[PDB]
């Protein structure tokens, strides 16, 4: 059963191709059910959205089609999905009296979001042909057509794409077509830019040939790391500024467009979402310097949107991008939003909130003061999910920021109470009291933790260790032998015969041992 | 070339068997040269000592033979080496007028150190036959012979060994031989002990069958771990008290005899020397309790000798046994000897004295006061060998014992001066200043170490890390971004593209990361 394969790997493309194979061996009423399941899984697959669209569109359900477009067209910059949308309009609206008006809008809307795609050539032509076609009676009318066609040609013949030449060719023949005289100069006047573009077109032509562009986006688990390689090159290529131009926004645009394409296939890579939002923040302030303020707060505002998208589409449970988000808004001093970001993450049913609380509570203190911080800490403690780590984080925070060894001891104690059976927690507590340097008290906590029986001896080895390390700094030989012999009695079982391998720890310091690697091996030594 | 094999593995038994194979294809003048080389390498090989002895003994150099015995007989408890010595006396002294007197001495000397060996049966007989043979004229003479023979029989028929039966057999026939009447009771009176022994003889008979006993002692580098297994069993067997007897000294004797045998083959295992000296110390105080004081200070004194031997024969450069030695004498409050032990180790040309100084200086303070300690520290600094570790050890010692942050800062500073290009050292220093909890000063040391250029940036990663960790506890987002961007500039090379894998460390705490194991993998994450 294909579903079974899916029970295992949800992204089993094999299973999906089967569901999709029979997706057609059935009416749009039963298929629709399977398609939703697909797009719901591969939201960024313009290819899948299309199977679904073409299927409904096959069934004459023009109403459901428009719905599907409003659901993906903006969100997915797939060259085909868009040429598809242009067709759906070319048909659907062809007989409306407002067609011309509406048709041009779509062409504009299209070239504006996807025209930069390397395989967009046709849209440009379809637009120009559409335009030449428009009926014009008189002269102010025809000449208005020229202004219109002239515009798409001029805009195209500077846009790096596969047939960038067949566009420049026909442009020439168009001017020459309305005036052989003035044409010469009309053309000569924009050739230096076209060359500059016809070139980048070729550079671009390469970087893309290796790339996939239709592969379903799948979480990382041979070729992906290979294709990953190719994408970043393309992204870098665009960052180096192929079109040797002083226009920064035209670089960011093209670099951002690349990040876009890439994310369609590698959208399950936090690093790329981040790296893309990093470039935006950068491009941003690099404009605040050269005086361009409006064109700047734009990228600044948008860079924040790269975060929203990422943690709202393909990576909803990803702490990395959340924190990276929270941080970004915190830098922009939007302390209000930062709160919302941390709380949306906490909002999610299943995650291990612990780190988030730790990250949230750290932002809080650091940005809204000691009480603000204690707010979060309080919520942290009231979340059944929160693990011991936060009481440690919090407690140290007092000590390290306030310099208060009271709230600290209390927070630890308040913790040792509820988490006193977590070796890592007890150690966290000990390690702290032990740097205060007060011998007796430390010795006290040691004896408690090892005698308070709330910590199962089987899981106390590290402690007994830390103890001897303590009885080794201060303290003396008899005190060491004492704790030592007790440590053995508690693990009499798994420590019988390993006395020597155990003795090794009585003397080693840092990378120094009183034995050779080979001697340690045969001893049965195990370094923690 | 065999020597070549030896150039590689000094303990290449193959090479040795070759040198030994041609060791005979040559006169004792040229062989002697090769033999010394052998025994010098396998000091505990009664088998090799014998090849050498029998070779010289073959050459009628009775003077050189006696020399070889005085060189190994006491030091090696090999059953054959001793039967060899008994032969060399049986011949060499056979015609001396004092022979009888001398011959009996050797038998006594033999049974006293080796008679407990499982394969000793013959020596006992050779002795008894020797005795019966002694001429006796009269009655006080003959009866004196009886007292003498009766004694070896009685002593033998209680000593667990292979033919323990053929000894009891002939004993019976001996009494019966001098009085069939009184014999009945003479025998019946010591049978309960003989049975008890004839039994243990069988138990012993087993434990030994698996063991080698002639394998050359070689440093650990399949069967050794297998034979290792068998030896400890035999040792344990003896510790459980086979002869169900209330005599503790007779247990220790037999347990100690086992440790002895074992060491002949596994003498390159520090753990066994130690484990043996541990049993002595134990058996010791376990006698100080039951009132037996003389028989106690004996084992106490000897246990110290197990250490001497070990670090003076097969393991001369072994810090473990030295420390374990120094400690033992320190427990016995012989603070004078402890000093000598640490200094003998230091005396050795090549070793990495650092740990020893650290171990010595720790004993010192802890047992002779703060100045005594500063003595050693001073020597430590005057040893060209001593590595950075001791200035750390020492400095912390002040802080942790004295509570003086001056000598500490000075010792560190005095150290940072000479070892300021050792990442581990700088970290040791930082980690300390950072638990004092004084933010500014720590920030100061941080900026120095990273700007004082005495530490090659290539080896500063950990620092920049500790820095961010510091700028993360106290400090704030901008301060983090700052150190962060600098950390990147310094490693612009190996960190380009790994920005995200790097960002991961900005948020992880203990075993918590803002990413899944699988997500971290594909990021190129590397946890320190």
CB-count exposure of residue B411 (10 Å: 0-12, 13-18, 19+): buried
Q: Measured between CB atoms, which of A271, A367, A393 is closest to B500?
A: A271
Token pair, residue B426, equals 């700088």
CA angle B413, B414, B420 (to 5 degrees): 70
Instruction: Using DSSP, state whether A509 is helix, strand or coil.
Output: strand
Tell me the backbone φ, ψ of residue A509, rounded to 5 degrees. -135, 125
Ranges of each domain in chain A? 1-190, 191-528
Closest CA to A228 of A279, A274, A257, A271: A271
> Which is nearest to B327 in space by CA: A48, A507, A528, A78?
A507
CA-angle at A262, arms to A258 and A264, nearest 5°: 125
Closest partner residue to A354 among B225, B504, B512, by Cβ? B512
List Cβ neighbours of B70 (8 Å cut-off, separation of 6 or more): none
Using the beta-carbon criterion (under 8 Å), do B473 and A503 form an inter-chain contact?
Answer: no
Residue of B nearest to A474 (CA): B401
Q: Which residues pair with B512 in a beta bridge?
A: B509
Residue B220: list chain A partners with CB under 8 A: 518-519, 521-522
The 3-state DSSP class for residue A515 equals coil
Whole-Å CA distances, B509 to A298, A392, A425, B138, B523: 35, 10, 13, 96, 18
Query: Nearest chain A Cα to B519, which residue?
Result: A220
Give the span between the Cα atoms of A66 and A61, in whole angstroms: 9
Task: Look at chain B and count its residues.
Answer: 528
User: Exposure of A401 by Cβ count < 10 A (0-12 exposed, 13-18 middle, 19+ buried)?
Assistant: middle
Distance, in Å, from the CA atom of B18 to the CA atom of B4, rounded to the nearest integer, reads 12
Set of chain B residues whose Cβ sits within 8 Å of the Cβ of A523:
270-271
Query: A509 pairs with which residues across the strands?
Result: A512
Chain B residues lying within 8 Å of A500, measured CB to CB: 270-271, 274-275, 320
Which are the contacts of B13, defined by CB distance < 8 A and separation ≥ 6? Answer: B216, B218
Residues on chain A touching B521 (C-beta within 8 angstroms): 220
From chain B, the residues in CB contact with A507 under 8 A are 319-320, 323, 355, 359
Q: Do B437 and A400 touch (CB under 8 A)?
A: yes
B431 CB-near residues (< 8 Å, 6+ apart): B466
Chain A residues with beta carbon closer than 8 angstroms to that of B225? 522
Q: What are the tokens at A286?
A: 């690099």
Q: Which residue has the tokens 């890579």?
A: A269
Task: Name B345's Cβ contacts closer than 8 Å, sequence gap at least 6.
Answer: B319, B322, B351, B356
* Cα–Cα dist A339/A472, whole Å: 47
Residue A388, both tokens: 């011991």
d(CA A393, CA A244): 51
Q: Cα(B469)–Cα(B442) distance, rounded to whole angstroms? A: 12
Q: Give Cβ neighbours of residue B186 (< 8 Å, ≥ 6 apart).
A: B175, B179
* Selected residue of B235, B267, B270 to mutate for chain A interface (largest A Cβ count, 10 A): B270
- Tell which residue, A216, A207, A220, has the closest CA to residue A270: A220
And the tokens for A301?
Answer: 């505002």
**Sign of dihedral through CA atoms A356, A357, A361, A362?**
negative
A125: left (phi > 0), else alpha (psi -120 to 50), else beta? alpha
User: Looking at chain B, which residue has its C-alpha nearest residue A513?
Assistant: B355
CB-based contact B507 A367, cutoff 8 Å: no
Which residues of A fall within a CB distance of 8 Å from B367? 476-477
* Cα gap A382→B158, rounded to integer Å: 76
Q: What is the CA radius of gyration of chain B?
A: 33
Residue in chain A nearest B228 by alpha carbon: A522
Q: CA-based angle B203:B208:B211, to the nearest 5?
A: 155
A–B: how many Cβ contacts below 8 A? 167
Task: Write out chain A residues lying below 8 Å of B218, CB-based.
Answer: none
Residues B374, B381: Cα–Cα separation, whole Å: 11
CATH number for the segment(s) B1-190: 1.25.40.10
Identify the three-state secondary structure at position A166. helix
Chain A: residue nearest B512 by CA? A355
C-alpha to C-alpha distance for B260 and B312, rounded to whole angstroms:
16
* Coil/strand/helix, residue B69: helix
Q: How many residues does chain A have?
A: 528
CA angle A233, A278, A338 (to 5 degrees): 150
Query: How far is the C-alpha of B249 from the C-alpha of B266, rounded, in Å?
Result: 25
CA distances from B387 to A438, A512, B384, B391, B393 (A): 29, 11, 8, 8, 11
- Measured between CA atoms, how close is A318 to chain B, in angstroms? 7
Question: Do B1-190 and B191-528 have matching folds?
Answer: yes
Tokens of B245: 């007897």
Q: CA angle, A347 as apex, A342 and A352 as ends, to 5°? A: 80
- What does residue A451 show for φ and ψ, rounded to 5 degrees? -120, -20
| Nearest-Cα residue of chain A relative to residue B497 | A275
User: Is B499 in Cβ contact with A271 (below 8 Å)?
Assistant: yes
Nearest CB partner across the interface for B509, out of A358, A363, A474: A358
Query: Residue A330's closest chain B neighbor by CA?
Result: B477
Kindly write down the DSSP assignment for every residue of A185-212, as one continuous string. HHHHTTHHHHHHHHHHHHHHHHHHHH--
Resolution of the PDB structure in angstroms:
3.0
A191-528: CATH number: 1.25.40.10
User: Which candidate from A269, A271, A523 shows the least CB-CB separation from B271?
Assistant: A523
């Amino acid at each position: 059963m294909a579903e079974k394969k899916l029970e295992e790997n949800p992204y089993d493309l094999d299973a999906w191709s089967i569901l999709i194979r029979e997706a057609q061996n059935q009416p749009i009423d039963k298929a629709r059910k399977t398609y939703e399941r697909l797009v719901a899984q591969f939201p960024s697959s313009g290819r899948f959205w299309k199977l679904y669209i073409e299927a409904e569109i096959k069934a004459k359900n023009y109403d459901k089609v428009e719905k599907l477009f409003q659901r993906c067209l903006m969100k997915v910059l797939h060259i085909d999905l868009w040429k598809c949308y242009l067709s759906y309009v070319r048909e659907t609206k062809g007989k409306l009296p407002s067609y011309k008006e509406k048709m041009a809008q779509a062409y504009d809307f299209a070239l504006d979001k996807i025209g930069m795609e390397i395989m967009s050539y046709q849209i440009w032509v379809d637009y120009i042909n559409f335009l030449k076609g428009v009926e014009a009676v008189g002269s102010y009318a025809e000449n208005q057509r020229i202004t219109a066609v002239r515009r798409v040609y001029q805009r195209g013949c500077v846009n790096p794409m596969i047939n960038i030449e067949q566009l420049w060719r026909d442009y020439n023949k168009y001017e020459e077509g309305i005036n052989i005289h003035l044409a010469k100069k009309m053309i000569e006047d924009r050739s230096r830019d076209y060359m500059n573009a016809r070139r980048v077109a070729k550079e671009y032509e390469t970087v893309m040939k290796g790339l996939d562009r239709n592969a379903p986006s799948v979480p990382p688990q041979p070729q992906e790391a290979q294709q990953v390689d190719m994408w970043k090159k393309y992204i870098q290529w665009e960052k180096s500024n192929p079109l040797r131009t002083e226009d920064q926004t035209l670089i960011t645009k093209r670099v951002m467009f690349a990040y876009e394409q890439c994310l369609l296939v590698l959208g399950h890579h936090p690093d790329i979402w981040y790296e893309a939002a990093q470039y935006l923040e950068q491009s941003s302030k690099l404009l605040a310097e050269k005086g361009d303020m409006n064109n700047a707060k734009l990228f600044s505002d948008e860079a924040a949107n790269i975060y929203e998208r990422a943690i709202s589409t393909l990576l909803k449970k990803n702490m990395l991008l959340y924190f990276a988000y929270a941080d970004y808004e915190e830098s922009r001093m939007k302390y209000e939003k930062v709160h919302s970001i941390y709380n949306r993450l906490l909002a999610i049913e299943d995650i291990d909130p612990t780190l988030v609380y730790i990250q949230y509570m750290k932002f809080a203190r650091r940005a809204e003061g000691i009480k603000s911080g204690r707010m979060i800490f309080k919520k942290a403690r009231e979340d059944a999910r929160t693990r011991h780590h936060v009481y440690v984080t919090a407690a140290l925070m007092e000590y390290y920021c306030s310099k208060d060894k009271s709230v600290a001891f209390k927070i630890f104690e308040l913790g040792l109470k509820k988490y006193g059976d977590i070796p890592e927690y007890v150690l966290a507590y000990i390690d702290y009291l032990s740097h205060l340097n007060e011998d007796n008290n430390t010795r006290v906590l040691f004896e408690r933790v090892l005698t308070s029986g709330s910590l199962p001896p089987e899981k106390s080895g590290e402690i007994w260790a830390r103890f001897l390390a303590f009885e080794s700094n201060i303290g003396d030989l008899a005190s060491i032998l004492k704790v030592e012999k007790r440590r053995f009695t508690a693990f009499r079982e798994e420590y019988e015969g390993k006395e020597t391998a155990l003795l090794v720890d009585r003397y080693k310091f840092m990378d120094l041992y009183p034995c050779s690697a080979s001697e340690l091996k045969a001893l049965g030594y195990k370094d923690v």
